[PDB]
Structure 1
Amino acid sequence: NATEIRASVGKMIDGIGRFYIQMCTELKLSDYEGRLIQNSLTIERMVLSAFDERRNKYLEEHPSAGKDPKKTGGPIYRRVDGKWRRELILYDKEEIRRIWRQANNGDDATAGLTHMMIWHSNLNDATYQRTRALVRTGMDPRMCSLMQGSTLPRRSGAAGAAVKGVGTMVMELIRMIKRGINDRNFWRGENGRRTRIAYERMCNILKGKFQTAAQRTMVDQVRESRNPGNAEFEDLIFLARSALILRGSVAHKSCLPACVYGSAVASGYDFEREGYSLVGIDPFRLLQNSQVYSLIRPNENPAHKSQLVWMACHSAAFEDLRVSSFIRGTKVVPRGKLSTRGVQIASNENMETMESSTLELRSRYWAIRTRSGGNTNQQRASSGQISIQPTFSVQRNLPFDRPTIMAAFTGNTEGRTSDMRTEIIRLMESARPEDVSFQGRGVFELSDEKATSPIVPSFDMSNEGSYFFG
C-alpha cells in the first residue's frame, strides 16, 4: 500500500512547515525575510546542531572554542529600508528542541531530520565537490560523480542510508582502514566489536546498492578479511572505478528548502489530505508557484544562481546538462564558466555589497526520478526465465539452464578479487558510450497528473558537454 507512506511523509512535511512558521513568528521577520535561503540555512543548521546528540555529548565534556556551552552560530540577515544587516544571535538547544517537540505532535521527527541532512548533502554536492579528501586518500579526483551525500554523518538512518553514495562509502571505509593501519584498533575490546559491526553493516548497504552479480560477490568476498591490510584498499578503489560504469542506484531524494514548505503550509495546503510524494510530480508542483529571495554579490550573476539553486533543490548537480536543460527549458552553464560562488556567504565579507533578488525555479517539464540504473547493464546481461514449473502432469524433461545455475551459486568459489577484476574489465570493454538507457520512459508535461503520455528527448547538439565538472 502507498497511502500510508504518503500520509506519513505529508504529516512530517506539515510538521516541518509549521515549525518554519513558528520560527517566522518568533524571529519577528518580515514577509520578504522568510523568503530568504540564508535564514533558512542558518536555522536549519542550528536544528542539525541541536538534534545531533553525538557531537553535543562530545561537546559538554569539551568546553572549548570560547563561547560554546550550548549556543552556536546564528547569522540572521534583516533588511533595513533597502540595505541589509547581519546579526550573530545565539539560541539555546533545549528551547528549540521543545519547539520541535510540539511542532510534530510530540514526536522526535527523525525522518524530518534526515530530510534536512539530505538537503544539506545536495547543497554541498551542488556547490563544492571534495576532491581534497579524494587526493588525501590517494583517490583520483576524476570520479567526483561518486560523491553523493559526502557531507552526511553516519547518524542518518536507513532513509539517510539510501542517499549516501558508493564513492562516499569507499571514502569512509578507507578512513577506517587507514585508522586501523595506524594503530591496532582491531583488538578484542568493545571498540573492535563496534567497528566490525559498522563495517559489515556498511558492506551490506554497499551490496544492496550495486546491481550486477559479479561486483556483489566480489564485495561479499571483501569482508572475508578479518584483518584488513592494504589489498582491500586497491580493491575498493577498483570497486569505485568499476562502479563508474556499473553505477549503483543509490538515491536522488528531491528535498526542498524550508521556506517553500513553510509558504505552502501557511497558505492552508494541508499535505495529509491530498497526499505528498517526494519522487513524483508533487515536489515539482509546489515550485512553479513558489517565490524565493536570496542575497547576491555585485559580481555574481543571478541567472546562474537560480539555475544552481534549482540544481541543489533537485539534486541534479551530477545529472547530464542536456536533459537538465531540457527539463528546465533553458541552457545550463557548467561549473567551468559559472560567474558565481557558493550560496553560503562568508562571515567576514562586508555588509554593503549584498543585494537581494528573486530566484527563478519554474521549469517547463517534469519527470519521475527512479532509483535505478542505465539499461546498458541489462543489455550486457539479458533477462528471461532460468527454471520451469510443471503445470500439466506429463512425462517430460524439466529444462534447467545449468551453466547459469552454477554462475548464480559460484560452485567453484572465487579465489581472490583478481579473477573478478578480469571479467569486470571484460564487461567494461563490452560497454559502449552510445547505449541508450531508460527504455519505455519519457518526460511528461506539467498539465499531466497521472503520467499518461510522455515525449522522448532527442539531443543532436554536437558535443556541448555532458560533464558539469571540467
Structure 2
Amino acid sequence: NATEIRASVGKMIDGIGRFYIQMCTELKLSDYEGRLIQNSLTIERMVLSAFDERRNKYLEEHPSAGKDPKKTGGPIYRRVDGKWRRELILYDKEEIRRIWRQANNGDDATAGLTHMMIWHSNLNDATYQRTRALVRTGMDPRMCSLMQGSTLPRRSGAAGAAVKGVGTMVMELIRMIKRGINDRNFWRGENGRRTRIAYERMCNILKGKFQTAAQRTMVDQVRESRNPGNAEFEDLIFLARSALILRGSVAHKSCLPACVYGSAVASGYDFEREGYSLVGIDPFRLLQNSQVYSLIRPNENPAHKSQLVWMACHSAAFEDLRVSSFIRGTKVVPRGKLSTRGVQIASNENMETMESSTLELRSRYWAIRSDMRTEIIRLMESARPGRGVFELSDEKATSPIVPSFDMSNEGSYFFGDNAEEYDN
C-alpha cells in the first residue's frame, strides 16, 4: 500500500545514483575526486542542460550567455602530484541524455532532474545574498527571507511553485508589471494572451502560498487588474511585507548531492527496494554516513564550508537558527559570521593554493517537518512569536524528544549578510 512512495522516490534516487557512477567511471575519476562536491555540482549541471535544451525549465541559463546549443560541459578537479588541478570537460548532450536515460532503465528521469535542480537551488539559497536585487526591484532587504527559490528557473512551475517563496513570487510578478508598464504592447496582443495567462498563473501560485484569507483575496484583487501598474506594484510590495510576519506556506524538499546518492548505490544500497522519502530519516541517515569532500580556499573555515552544505542539504537557510542548531548538534551561526566564500570555484581562482577537506554533514537528531490592507495590517499587529525531533536510532515516531532551545540566541541567518550577490 505504502510501497509506491518508497519506490518511485527510491527508484528516483537509484537512477541519480547509477547515473553519477557511470559518469565518474566515464570521466576516469578517483573515489575522492568523485566525492568532491565541486565535481558533483558540475556533473548535475550537465544532465539538466541536455534535458533543458534551451527552455530554462531545468537550468538557469543566461539569455546572451555563450554556450554551444548541442554540447554541454563543466570544470572537473582532480588531484595530481598533490596539487589540485582544474580540468575542463565537454560532452555531447546525447552522451548525457543517453547515459542518464540508461541510468534510469529507459525512463526519462524527470523527478531526478527536478531533485538535482532543487538541490542546486537550496545550495544557492544558503550561499548567495539577494538584497542588492531586492532593492533594485523596489523591495526591501528584510525581504531576503521570503526569497527561497529566487535562483531557480521560472520553468518547472509545480516544483518551482512548491519550493518558491512569497518574495520570489512577488519579485517575479513585480518585474512583469515593469516590463508591461514600460512596454506598451506587453498586455495587449498575442503576448498579452500568452503572458496574461502566465501573469495570472503566477498570481495563483503566490496566492496559494498565503494562509490568511485576507492575503489570499488581496492577491485576487491584484490579479484582476487588466493593466497592472504602480497600484498593483505597491500591493505586491505590501503582500511581500505581510509575509514577514504572517509566514506563507512554502515547500522544502531535502535534496542531496548526486555524489552522495551515487556513493551509496555503489556501496550496495538498493533504494527503489528499501524505499525512500525526503520527509523522514532517509536523507538524515544517508547524510549520516556521509563522506563528501570540498576544495577549500586559503583561510577558509572547514567547519563553515560544511555548515553551508549541511544547511542546503536540509533546506534550512530560511530556518530559525535556533531550530536548526538544536538539530545540527552545534550552533548554526548567521551567514555573516561564516568564513567561506562558496562551495564553487571561479575560473579566476588560483588552484595552486587550493585546499581539500571533509565536510562534516551529520546531525544529532532528525526531525519531521484597500480595505484588505487594513485587515492584513491588524492581523500582523496581533501576530505571535517548532518541530518534533527524534534520536537517529528511533526509526519510528516512538518518542519525540523535546526541544531544549536557547531563546536568547541569533535566529536569523540574514542579519549582517556577508555573502556574494547572485549575479548568476
**TM-score scaled by structure 1?**
0.83
CA distance in 1, matches of 2:209, 2:196: 20
SS at match of 1:55: coil
Per-residue deviation, 1:3: 2.9
CA distance in 2, matches of 1:276, 1:109: 16
More off after superposition, 254-263 vs 188-197 = 188-197
Identity %: 100
1:400 maps to which residue?
none
The answer to whether 1:175 aligns with 2:175 is: yes
CA distance in 2, matches of 1:132, 1:64: 22
Contact 1:60–1:69 (8 Å) recurs in 2: no
Contact 1:114–1:157 (8 Å) recurs in 2: no
Per-residue deviation, 1:73: 4.5
The answer to whether 1:441 aligns with 2:387 is: yes
2:376 maps to which residue?
424
Contact 1:9–1:276 (8 Å) recurs in 2: yes
Contact 2:20–2:43 (8 Å) recurs in 1: no
Per-residue deviation, 1:462: 2.7
RMSD: 2.6
Cα-to-partner distance string for 1:46-83 (whole Å, 9 max, x where unaligned): 22222213348999999986773533441111111321
Contact 1:441–1:454 (8 Å) recurs in 2: no
Cα-to-partner distance string for 1:339-378 (whole Å, 9 max, x where unaligned): 211111111111211111111112111101xxxxxxxxxx
CA distance in 2, matches of 1:329, 1:60: 34
Q: Which runs of 5+ in 1 are unaligned?
A: 369-417, 434-439
Contact 1:304–1:333 (8 Å) recurs in 2: no
**TM-score scaled by structure 2?**
0.92
**Cα gap change, 1:70 to 1:196, in 2 (>3 Å):** same
SS at match of 2:323: helix
**Cα gap change, 1:57 to 1:340, in 2 (>3 Å):** closer
Contact 1:294–1:357 (8 Å) recurs in 2: yes
SS at match of 2:118: helix
More off after superposition, 233-242 vs 77-86 = 77-86
CA distance in 2, matches of 1:25, 1:86: 18
SS at match of 2:408: coil
CA distance in 1, matches of 2:380, 2:105: 52
Cα-to-partner distance string for 1:246-281 (whole Å, 9 max, x where unaligned): 111111110000111001111221112121001111
Per-residue deviation, 1:454: 1.0
SS at match of 2:10: helix
Q: Which runs of 5+ in 2 are unaligned?
A: 417-424
CA distance in 1, matches of 2:240, 2:142: 11
**Cα gap change, 1:63 to 1:145, in 2 (>3 Å):** closer
Per-residue deviation, 1:306: 1.2
Q: How does 1:173-212 map to 2 (within 5 A)?
A: 173-186=173-186, 188-212=188-212
**Cα gap change, 1:92 to 1:56, in 2 (>3 Å):** farther
Contact 2:33–2:78 (8 Å) recurs in 1: yes
**Cα gap change, 1:135 to 1:53, in 2 (>3 Å):** same
SS at match of 1:78: strand
CA distance in 2, matches of 1:230, 1:313: 39
1:122 maps to which residue?
122
Cα-to-partner distance string for 1:379-405 (whole Å, 9 max, x where unaligned): xxxxxxxxxxxxxxxxxxxxxxxxxxx
1:82 maps to which residue?
82
> Based on CA coordinates, which of the two structures has the bigger radius of gyration?
1
Q: Aligned pair count? A: 415
**Cα gap change, 1:332 to 1:72, in 2 (>3 Å):** same
CA distance in 2, matches of 1:61, 1:68: 12
- Higher RCO (Cα < 8 Å, 6 or more apart): 2
Contact 1:367–1:443 (8 Å) recurs in 2: yes
CA distance in 2, matches of 1:207, 1:120: 25
SS at match of 2:86: strand
